[PDB]
Design a binder for this molecule. Structure first.
Ligand code: CA
Ligand code: CA
Ligand code: CA
Ligand code: CA
Lengths: 123, 123, 122, 123
C-alpha cells in the first residue's frame, strides 16, 4: 500500500536525522603550545544557539540547537536539529584560565590552556 | 606493545575519520516552485576546493577536498578530509535551466530547476 | 589506562563487525537437479531468519539477533546481524517452490534449477 | 584451460575453508557471579566430536572435527572441517571446581568457576 510505503519513508528519514544528531559533530583534538585545541565541524548553526562548557570533571560538553522549516514537498530531512556531544579531556585543564571558542565557516574551535606539569603521589 | 598500541590507535583514528567521510554530509531536500533545493552540512571546507556536479543519469554529486595539518600531539582526528556523495534526485532536472550553488556558514545550498508533469483525469 | 580501555572496546566491536561480514560460511553443491546451500548459522531464532531469491539470481540470507549479558564482558565477538548475498552459479527454476530447513545451527536451502539452456539460432 | 581454472577454484575453495577454520568460532565472554561464561557459535557438529579442555596455563581450548562429503558438483566448500581455538581466560579458574559445557542450536556454552578476590581499604 502507498500509505504503508509513505510511512516507511518518513521513519527512515527520521532515523537518519537521529543518526546524524548522535554522530555530529566529528572532532579533532590536539595539544599545541601548552594549549589543548578541539575542532568540530558544526555547519548551519547560530552562535547564540551554541553552548560550550567545561564540567568540573574535565569533561568537555557541546550543545547546539536549530529550527529548520521548509516550504514545499520534502524529500529528505537529514540535518540534525539537536546536537549534544560530551568529550573526554585527556589532561587536567588550568583552572581559571581563559578558554577561547571561535566559530568560523561552520567550524567550532576550542582552545583550552594546558598545564605542563603533574604533581605525583607518594606511596 | 607500546609501539603497537600507538600504531593501533593511529589505525583506529583513521577508521573513525573514514566513517565520517562516508556519512558527511547529511542533506535536506525539498522542492518548491519548480525548484529542487538540496542543503548539505559541509563545514570547514574551501569553496575553491568544493565541486558540485550534475549527472546525465540525474544524480547530484558533491565532492569536497581539504588538507589537515596538525602540529604537536594528536588525540583525535575524526574530521573528514575527502568527501564524495552521490544523490539520486527525486525529480528530473530541467534540461536547459540555470543551476545555483552557494556556500555559507559551512553550508552548501544547491538549487536545481525541475521538469515534471501530472495528468488530470477528464470527466 | 582508560584510553587503553577505550581501544579495547573498539577492537572488540571491530571484531564483531568482522564476524558479521564473514558469517556464515557456505557449502554449495548440486544434487538431483537441485542446488543445495548449507550455511553455518549458530544461535539464531528461526523466526528471525529470512531467505529470499533475487531477480538477479543472487541468494540472500538475512538474520538478526539480540545478545544481552549481565556482568563484566571480556569479549563480544558473536554477530548480532548477518546480511549475506550469494551469486548463483546456475539459473534457478521458474515457479519451482524452494524449501529451507534449520537445525543444529545449520540452515539448509534447496533450490530447483533449470536443467537445460535453449540456444539462439542465428 | 577451464579445467585448470577449476583446479585453481578448488585451491581457492580450500583456502576459504582454511580461513574459516582459523576464525571459527567467534566467542562471547562474560563473567557473572563467580562464573566465567564463554559462548561460541559452532554449528553443524556432532556432540561426540567436540572437545572442551581446560589448561594448566589457564587457557580454554575448543576442538571440533566433522566429515563433510557431498554428492554431485560442488560449487563451494567454505564450512570448516576441523576446529582448534585457544582462549586465554581473563581470570583464574577455580581449582577442582565443576565446569559445564552445553551444546544446543549449534551453540557451545561453557561455564567456568573462577578464583578471584578484591581488597577493601580499612577505615
Ligand atoms: Ca500504519
Ligand atoms: Ca520556535
Ligand atoms: Ca588445507
Ligand atoms: Ca589446515
Amino acid at each position: 500500500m502507498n500509505v504503508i510505503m509513505r510511512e516507511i519513508g518518513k521513519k527512515l528519514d527520521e532515523l537518519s536525522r537521529e543518526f546524524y544528531e548522535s554522530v555530529i559533530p566529528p572532532i579533532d583534538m590536539y595539544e599545541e603550545g601548552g594549549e589543548l585545541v578541539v575542532v568540530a565541524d558544526l555547519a548551519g548553526f547560530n552562535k547564540d544557539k551554541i553552548s560550550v562548557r567545561l564540567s568540573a570533571q574535565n569533561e568537555l560538553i557541546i550543545n547546539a540547537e536549530r529550527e529548520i522549516q521548509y516550504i514545499g514537498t520534502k524529500y529528505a530531512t537529514q540535518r540534525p536539529l539537536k546536537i549534544h556531544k560530551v568529550i573526554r579531556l585527556p589532561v587536567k585543564v588550568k583552572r581559571d584560565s581563559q578558554v577561547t571558542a571561535k566559530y568560523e565557516n561552520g567550524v567550532l574551535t576550542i582552545r583550552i590552556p594546558v598545564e605542563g606539569s603533574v604533581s605525583i603521589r607518594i606511596e
